[PDB]
């Protein structure tokens, strides 16, 4: 989550798993499922929805040039 | 192992040994610290 | 308290001075009082260890130059331009 | 020094038989065994051995020290006898022992069949354990070493031939 240019915000330890809470950019979550699986032996749901817009890191920004 | 010209201890467990004509470094904890051409 | 054995210099000049320093000796001079100056030659490692203490430059100290005890104070020191060694010392007669 | 300088008891029942520079030592079990020394001076008499430098070898002492140490393990060797103890780890890892040859099944496409050298013999409490007793310390080490070599313990599931006093790494994999 951190590697994915992400900010973390909480942990519960909800019963058996451990819900982890984070704000992580869209252009960076692509194909999460695939790897989240690899990291947790297939045992790991996840979910996401829109939250906000924040500044894009420069190398990102100057890349995003049409 | 790393080869280098300057070798020196890294961990507190790195040890330094002169085998054959060559100066070496052996770490019992951390393989990354092996060194030769010293 | 500092006791410095020494010997009067039999040779003077750039030539000798260098020679002395090759043999862990080193020249220095005692002057002051109303009597003439005196050309001294000191054992190096000794004065070095001695002058390691700060008292060396403050205290009065004694030089036993051919059995006399002249008793003087360190005026000036010449250290090597880039080594840890001494080149020369001025001693004032007290 | 120290190790050189310390003496070394010859426990009741042992032979010893110096002849110039060739010690030999029999005891309870064990094919005796025989080393050579060089710039060492070995001194019997007493119920001990003692080692010291020989005039004119700058290598002396360091030599004596080894010498003492070697002789020592011979005494301890031919008397108590020496240890061993290996254990297999990994699905499908058998060990047999027919006479003086271990029969290992280490997930290869062929058997291995490692023949024990001379003064060394092997047993198998389980299909996943090998203890081999012997007198000659230098060799006993070697054979276990050889045995470990057929499949050095890999660091992900520790699979392969272990010692037992080993430490074995183990790293978190990291797909992908």
């Amino acid at each position: 989550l951190s590697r994915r240019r992400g900010m973390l915000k909480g942990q519960e330890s909800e019963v058996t798993g451990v819900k982890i809470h984070a704000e992580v950019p869209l252009s960076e979550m692509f194909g999460y499922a695939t790897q989240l699986r690899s990291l947790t032996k297939g045992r790991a749901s996840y979910t996401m929805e829109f939250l906000k817009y924040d500044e894009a890191p420069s190398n990102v920004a100057q890349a995003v040039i049409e | 192992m790393k080869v280098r010209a300057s070798v020196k201890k890294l961990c507190r467990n790195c040890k330094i040994v002169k085998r054959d004509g060559v100066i070496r470094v052996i770490c019992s904890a951390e393989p990354k610290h092996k060194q030769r051409q010293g | 308290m500092f006791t410095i054995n020494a010997e009067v210099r039999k040779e003077q000049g750039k030539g000798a001075s260098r020679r002395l320093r090759a043999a862990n000796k080193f020249p220095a001079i005692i002057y002051g009082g109303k009597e003439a100056p005196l050309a001294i030659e000191l054992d190096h490692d000794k004065v070095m260890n001695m002058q390691a203490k700060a008292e060396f430059y403050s205290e009065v100290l004694t030089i036993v130059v051919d059995g006399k005890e002249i008793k003087v104070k360190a005026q000036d020191v010449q250290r090597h331009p880039y080594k840890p060694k001494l080149q020369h010392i001025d001693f004032v007669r007290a | 020094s120290r190790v050189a300088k310390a003496p070394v008891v010859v426990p009741a029942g042992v032979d010893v038989k110096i002849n110039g520079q060739v010690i030999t030592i029999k005891g309870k079990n064990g094919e005796l065994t025989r080393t050579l020394n060089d710039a060492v001076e070995v001194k019997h008499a007493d119920n001990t051995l003692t080692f010291g430098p020989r005039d004119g070898y700058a290598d002396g002492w360091a030599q004596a020290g080894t010498a003492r140490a070697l002789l020592n393990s011979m005494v301890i060797g031919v008397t108590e006898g020496f240890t061993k103890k290996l254990q297999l780890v990994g699905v499908g890892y058998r060990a047999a022992v027919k006479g003086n040859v271990i029969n290992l099944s280490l997930g290869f496409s062929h058997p291995v069949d490692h023949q024990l050298p001379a003064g060394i013999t092997a047993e198998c409490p389980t299909q996943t354990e090998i203890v081999l007793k012997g007198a000659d310390k230098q060799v006993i080490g070697q054979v276990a070493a050889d045995l470990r070599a057929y499949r050095r313990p890999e660091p992900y599931k520790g699979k392969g031939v272990r010692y037992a006093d080993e430490v074995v790494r183990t790293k978190e994999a990291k797909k992908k």
Binding site: E12, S13, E14, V15, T16 | - | - | -
Partner: protein, 141 residues
């Protein structure tokens, strides 16, 4: 107790032993019974007081049920509801910000008499000095 076996302390609360987002499940799920810390805890709760910080250890092996133990409150925390300010800085401790009650520190420490090594109850004070010079907050002694 001459033999430790399992202990995790995550300061709970008295008035209702039935959390869920803070602790809840994570306080009892490996041979532990969520049903019995509201049967048993509260049996040792109301005799004293309710609401405030409670670290705790329990006696669960893999034996189904258990028996609950009690403990003691944090000591630099008795400098919150037992001193003044409830943070500890505001000006990072490059600045010596806090402020003390010298009277307190002994009897408010003494309240933690059952968990300290000093024989001299005055000694048990001298510990609270550094515990309360934790910022560099001087005491008007």
């Amino acid at each position: 107790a001459k033999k430790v076996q399992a202990y995790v302390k995550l300061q709970v609360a008295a008035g209702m032993a039935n959390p869920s987002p803070p602790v809840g499940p994570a306080l009892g799920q490996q041979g532990v019974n969520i049903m019995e810390f509201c049967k048993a805890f509260n049996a040792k709760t109301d005799s004293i007081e309710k609401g405030l910080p409670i670290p705790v250890v329990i006696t669960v092996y893999a034996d189904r049920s258990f028996t609950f133990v009690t403990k003691t409150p944090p000591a630099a925390v008795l400098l919150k509801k037992a001193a003044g300010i409830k943070s500890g800085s505001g000006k990072p401790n490059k600045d010596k910000v806090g402020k003390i009650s010298r009277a307190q520190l002994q009897e408010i420490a003494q309240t933690k008499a059952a968990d300290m090594t000093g024989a001299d109850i005055e000694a048990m004070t001298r510990s609270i000095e550094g515990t309360a010079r934790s910022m560099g907050l001087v005491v008007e002694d």
